Amino acid sequence: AYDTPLGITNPPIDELLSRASSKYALVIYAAKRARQINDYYNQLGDGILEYVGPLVEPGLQEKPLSIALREIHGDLLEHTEG
Amino acid sequence: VPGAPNRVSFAKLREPLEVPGLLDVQTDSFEWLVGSDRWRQAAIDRGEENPVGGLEEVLAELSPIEDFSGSMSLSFSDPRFDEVKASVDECKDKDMTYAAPLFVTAIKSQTVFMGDFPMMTEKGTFIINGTERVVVSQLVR
Amino acid sequence: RRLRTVGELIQNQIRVGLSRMERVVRERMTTQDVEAITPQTLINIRPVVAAIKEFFGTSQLSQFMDQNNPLSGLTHKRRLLALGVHPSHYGRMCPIETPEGPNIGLIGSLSVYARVNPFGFIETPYRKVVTDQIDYLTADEEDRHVMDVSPRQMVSVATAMIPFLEHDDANRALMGANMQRQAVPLVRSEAPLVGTGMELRAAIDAGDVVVADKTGVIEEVSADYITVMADDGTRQSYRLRKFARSNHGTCANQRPIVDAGQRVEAGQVIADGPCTQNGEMALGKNLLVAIMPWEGHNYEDAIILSNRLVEEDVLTSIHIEEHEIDARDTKLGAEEITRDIPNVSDEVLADLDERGIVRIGAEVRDGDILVGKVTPKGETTPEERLLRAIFGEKAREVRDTSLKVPHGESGKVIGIRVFSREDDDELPAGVNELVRVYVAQKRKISDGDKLAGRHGNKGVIGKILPVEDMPFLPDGTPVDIILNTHGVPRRMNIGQILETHLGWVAKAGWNIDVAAGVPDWASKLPEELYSAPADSTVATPVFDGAQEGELAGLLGSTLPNRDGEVMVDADGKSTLFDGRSGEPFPYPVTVGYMYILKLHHLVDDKIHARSTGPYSMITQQPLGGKAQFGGQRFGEMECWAMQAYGAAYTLQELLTIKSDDTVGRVKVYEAIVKGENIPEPGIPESFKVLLKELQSLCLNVEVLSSDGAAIEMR
Amino acid sequence: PVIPPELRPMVQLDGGRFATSDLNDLYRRVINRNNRLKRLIDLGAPEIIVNN
Numbered sequence: 007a008y009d010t011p012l013g014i015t016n017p018p019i020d021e022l023l024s025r026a027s028s029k030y031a032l033v034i035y036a037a038k039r040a041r042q043i044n045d046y047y048n049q050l051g052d053g054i055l056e057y058v059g060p061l062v063e064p065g066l067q068e069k070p071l072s073i074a075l076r077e078i079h080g081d082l083l084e085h086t087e088g
Numbered sequence: 089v090p091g092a093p094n095r096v097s098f099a100k101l102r103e104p105l106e107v108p109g110l111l112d113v114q115t116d117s118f119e120w121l122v123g124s125d126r127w128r129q130a131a132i133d134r135g136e137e138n139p140v141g142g143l144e145e146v147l148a149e150l151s152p153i154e155d156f157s158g159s160m161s162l163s164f165s166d167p168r169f170d171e172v173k174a175s176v177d178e179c180k181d182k183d184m185t186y187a188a189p190l191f192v193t194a195i196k197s198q199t200v201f202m203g204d205f206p207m208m209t210e211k212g213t214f215i216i217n218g219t220e221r222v223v224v225s226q227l228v229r
Numbered sequence: 230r231r232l233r234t235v236g237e238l239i240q241n242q243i244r245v246g247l248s249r250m251e252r253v254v255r256e257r258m259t260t261q262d263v264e265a266i267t268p269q270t271l272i273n274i275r276p277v278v279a280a281i282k283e284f285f286g287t288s289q290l291s292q293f294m295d296q297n298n299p300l301s302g303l304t305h306k307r308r309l310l311a312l313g314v315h316p317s318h319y320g321r322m323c324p325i326e327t328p329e330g331p332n333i334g335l336i337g338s339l340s341v342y343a344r345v346n347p348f349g350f351i352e353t354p355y356r357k358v359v360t361d362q363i364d365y366l367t368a369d370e371e372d373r374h375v376m377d378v379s380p381r382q383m384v385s386v387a388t389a390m391i392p393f394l395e396h397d398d399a400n401r402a403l404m405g406a407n408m409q410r411q412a413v414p415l416v417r418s419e420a421p422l423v424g425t426g427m428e429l430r431a432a433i434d435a436g437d438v439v440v441a442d443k444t445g446v447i448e449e450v451s452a453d454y455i456t457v458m459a460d461d462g463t464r465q466s467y468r469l470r471k472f473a474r475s476n477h478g479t480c481a482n483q484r485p486i487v488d489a490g491q492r493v494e495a496g497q498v499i500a501d502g503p504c505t506q507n508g509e510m511a512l513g514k515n516l517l518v519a520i521m522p523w524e525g526h527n528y529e530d531a532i533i534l535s536n537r538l539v540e541e542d543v544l545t546s547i548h549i550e551e552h553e554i555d556a557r558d559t560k561l562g563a564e565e566i567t568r569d570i571p572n573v574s575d576e577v578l579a580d581l582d583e584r585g586i587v588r589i590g591a592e593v594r595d596g597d598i599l600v601g602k603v604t605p606k607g608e609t610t611p612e613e614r615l616l617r618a619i620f621g622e623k624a625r626e627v628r629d630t631s632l633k634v635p636h637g638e639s640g641k642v643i644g645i646r647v648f649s650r651e652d653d654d655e656l657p658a659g660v661n662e663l664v665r666v667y668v669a670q671k672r673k674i675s676d677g678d679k680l681a682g683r684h685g686n687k688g689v690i691g692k693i694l695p696v697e698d699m700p701f702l703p704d705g706t707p708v709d710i711i712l713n714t715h716g717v718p719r720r721m722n723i724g725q726i727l728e729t730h731l732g733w734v735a736k737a738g739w740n741i742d743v744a745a746g747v748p749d750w751a752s753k754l755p756e757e758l759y760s761a762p763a764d765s766t767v768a769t770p771v772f773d774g775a776q777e778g779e780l781a782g783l784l785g786s787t788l789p790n791r792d793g794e795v796m797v798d799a800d801g802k803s804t805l806f807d808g809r810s811g812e813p814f815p816y817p818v819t820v821g822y823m824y825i826l827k828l829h830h831l832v833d834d835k836i837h838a839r840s841t842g843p844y845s846m847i848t849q850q851p852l853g854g855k856a857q858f859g860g861q862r863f864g865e866m867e868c869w870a871m872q873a874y875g876a877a878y879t880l881q882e883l884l885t886i887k888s889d890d891t892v893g894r895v896k897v898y899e900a901i902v903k904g905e906n907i908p909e910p911g912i913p914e915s916f917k918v919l920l921k922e923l924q925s926l927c928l929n930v931e932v933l934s935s936d937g938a939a940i941e942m943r
Numbered sequence: 944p945v946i947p948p949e950l951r952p953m954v955q956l957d958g959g960r961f962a963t964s965d966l967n968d969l970y971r972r973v974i975n976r977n978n979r980l981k982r983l984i985d986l987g988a989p990e991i992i993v994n995n
């Protein structure tokens with residue numbers, strides 16, 4: 007159902023909450039990954055650190071925070087909860 | 089009203105007494121204060137025969153101020169007015185205040201000046217520093 | 230009821246100025262020997278002139294006059310402060326026009342017929358019972374109390390102008406009074422179609438209308454002035470206020486209503502004021518209304534309007550704002566106002582004249598310079614001097630200080646007043662030049678503007694529909710506004726519906742078509758009320774006005790339109806066609822003409838947006854309330870909601886780098902421009918100021934980490 | 944201790960007027976009397992004036 011999510015509401019938070027423990031863990035999850043993607047796109051980030059991404063097919067002008075949400079939705083990355 | 093438009097009234101009754109000048113609340117007081125000759129026409133259909141002015145009443149109750157050691161004749165009476173310095177348009181344009189200078193005309197008898205005394209316009213307003221002001225009325229017991 | 234009147238409360242302030250002046254004449258006459266003393270030399274009039282100067286300037290009773298319409302200024306006068314309900318309040322001072330704010334009960338307006346006794350007592354007029362003589366009623370007349378003078382004794386002017394006042398609730402009646410004194414003058418100034426009899430009497434006495442002093446005939450009629458040739462032979466002339474900026478910025482414009490050949494009697498209206506038409510208050514327009522809810526665009530308070538109102542400038546109003554700038558007597562020397570700006574393009578000053586002031590008639594948008602001005606320099610960067618020397622520009626001092634237009638406003642320049650030092654004029658000490666620029670705006674009605682009627686109803690403009698798609702009568706005549714019904718079954722505001730039907734009765738006329746007498750609903754009616762043509766104004770006094778029976782009788786009589794079809798039934802409803810789908814609306818919808826107003830709250834003034842701007846000196850937080858870029862306040866209540874969501878970062882961003890981080894808000898604007906990650910916030914300046922405030926209180930505070938015992942912010 | 948000046952500023956207002964915090968007058972109240980006390984002690988003034 008929910009014929010098709012539009013913009014911010016995609017992906018649904020229900021299908022996202024299965025990838026992490028809490029909604030708060032979801033925030034730090036996608037937020038730090040957005041920092042990694044936006045780094046990679048500008049250029050290599052901090053001292054002696056090579057940053058990767060994006061893993062999923064990027065959108066036309068898709069923001070780095072919207073990409074990281076699609077990455078978590080597909081289980082393309084795991085985090086250490088706590 | 090002579091030039092009043094035609095407006096059909098659903099009221100079957102009659103109001104004999106026309107509304108008094110709603111602006112008279114401001115004008116009648118300031119005319120009583122300065123002691124205008126128009127308020128002096130209130131003695132034409134007279135009441136109490138004496139038209140004592142507000143400034144005169146304040147000046148008369150204090151007059152004379154008697155020094156304790158020796159008597160001093162400081163009695164003040166018959167205050168004088170001068171025509172208003174400038175028009176309301178000039179006072180609002182030049183940012184000055186609409187006022188008429190007032191000097192008291194009263195043991196030496198040397199007439200003394202007091203200061204610029206603000207005046208009320210026909211609309212019942214005061215121009216104080218180029219701004220049109222209205223003095224509300226206060227209700228105490 | 231003391232009722233301190235202006236002159237009487239003026240005199241009381243003169244007492245203090247004279248008494249404190251006499252205290253000096255007692256003391257300073259003793260030290261100096263006699264025969265060197267006169268009432269003149271010893272009396273210093275400063276305490277007397279200071280008291281009156283201190284009264285109008287500092288007194289709460291001396292108020293900045295409120296005039297966006299003649300009624301507001303008329304009701305600002307006659308207002309009274311009650312700080313020191315009952316039977317004595319009836320007929321003396323109505324609690325009906327008390328403000329809706331927390332000051333309710335302390336502030337009220339004088340009744341219509343109230344007269345003031347010389348001692349301060351409020352005298353109500355009445356007729357002893359029904360004797361024809363009118364005597365002053367008061368507490369003295371309350372001892373022997375037996376007939377009132379007239380209805381609406383307890384009703385003020387603002388309240389007496391609401392048709393069908395008896396039907397609405399006291400709250401809605403109160404709000405209606407405040408809504409009327411909030412109206413803005415429209416360029417057209419169309420008179421109300423249905424109303425009371427107070428429009429005429431309140432307009433002329435407001436003072437903003439041109440009244441004839443003596444009977445005569447007009448000699449000349451021009452937009453500038455009007456001359457009247459009296460039979461007595463004397464010559465009177467009246468200069469008309471033309472686009473004069475009011476106290477609150479509403480255009481005060483006077484229109485001559487007479488022609489040269491006309492013969493005018495004394496007391497007649499020669500020209501209309503800003504909000505008057507033909508000598509009676511016109512605070513709004515007459516519009517065709519539909520009370521059907523229309524696809525949620527009029528949801529809950531919102532109102533939908535036809536694009537016709539934007540095209541025909543019916544709700545358009547002129548707004549004028551004054552800007553000022555001054556000259557020398559500065560810190561490091563006297564600055565000069567000049568056209569020359571330090572470094573700008575020739576096209577930026579293209580609209581500036583030889584002096585550097587914006588030329589009249591020119592259009593100005595956000596950021597454009599009005600008055601060019603320079604300041605004395607510090608004359609004390611290396612990287613800027615190099616480019617200066619390379620291309621030849623010089624460190625000509627200077628700091629650019631120009632009066633630009635405030636962000637978010639635009640218009641045309643109507644006039645400039647300049648006060649220079651060369652001419653001898655009066656100005657403050659050291660200030661050489663003073664120039665004031667007046668800019669006018671023709672404001673179209675726009676979505677978001679607040680409209681209201683005389684019954685207290687109010688609401689923003691939800692949407693402006695093109696004239697093509699609107700519920701329209703079978704005539705093809707679209708409705709101007711579309712109201713909603715759901716307000717009634719809690720607040721009930723019945724009067725709003727009554728004038729809506731009478732508005733249609735007056736627009737289309739009527740003829741009772743008497744056959745074998747007159748109907749029973751016309752029993753209490755006069756004969757002149759029958760058979761009126763279209764577009765006829767109507768007067769319904771508050772308590773002696775129309776009644777429900779006569780209304781429906783008029784609803785049954787409707788002069789058809791051009792083709793002879795009847796557009797409204799006896800129920801005041803009609804079958805409207807949806808301008809979008811074309812299908813007719815399944816049920817008959819109530820239509821009519823209601824008198825609505827344009828309130829002073831406008832979208833152009835109430836919209837604010839800020840990305841970066843100036844910051845306060847003591848506290849490094851942003852500062853709103855200046856000519857540009859006001860910042861929004863994030864209170865603790867908002868901080869409580871932000872914590873309830875559990876959003877720690879969002880709360881930290883608002884309170885540190887968006888508000889108080891000295892090095893934070895600059896590095897974020899830098900990172901955003903480069904497109905980098907946003908850095909971690911620092912220490913808010915509010916907290917650093919907190920520590921110093923503690924140290925100045927002799928409290929030794931120390932911020933200790935896990936190690937390195939004490940750290941100093943610096 | 945004396946609070947830094949930027950937290951108790953004195954700056955020129957619009958139209959040429961001056962503005963300042965109250966702390967400057969309250970600090971001025973203290974330093975004025977503390978100094979006059981030094982003058983009284985060095986003057987050998989009576990104890991009534993000094994203790995006052």
Ligand SMILES: CC(=O)O[C@H]1[C@H](C)[C@H](O)[C@H](C)[C@@H](O)[C@@H]([C@H](C)OC(=O)C(C)(C)CC(=O)O)CC/C=C(/C)C(=O)Nc2cc(O)c3c4c(c(C)c(O)c3c2O)O[C@](C)(O/C=C/[C@H](O[C@H]2C[C@@H]3OCO[C@@H]3[C@@H](C)O2)[C@H]1C)C4=O
Nearest residue numbers: 224286287288289290291292293294295305310328332336
């Ligand atoms: C700058 C100024 O002069 O403001 C004036 C006054 C507001 C202006 O006349 C203003 C133009 C006003 O006429 C219009 C305005 C549009 O209305 C509104 O602002 C709102 C938005 C609320 C209305 C609305 O849109 O809903 C329309 C007003 C219509 C109504 C039913 C109304 O408001 N009634 C009203 C409201 C009041 O609050 C007070 C009030 C007050 C006294 C003694 C009053 O009688 C008040 C009063 O009758 O005592 C207080 C504590 O303080 C007093 C403060 C000020 O007096 C000065 C007088 C001296 O001038 C300089 O030094 C003095 C200075 C220190 O105080 C007040 C009296 C105070 O709160």
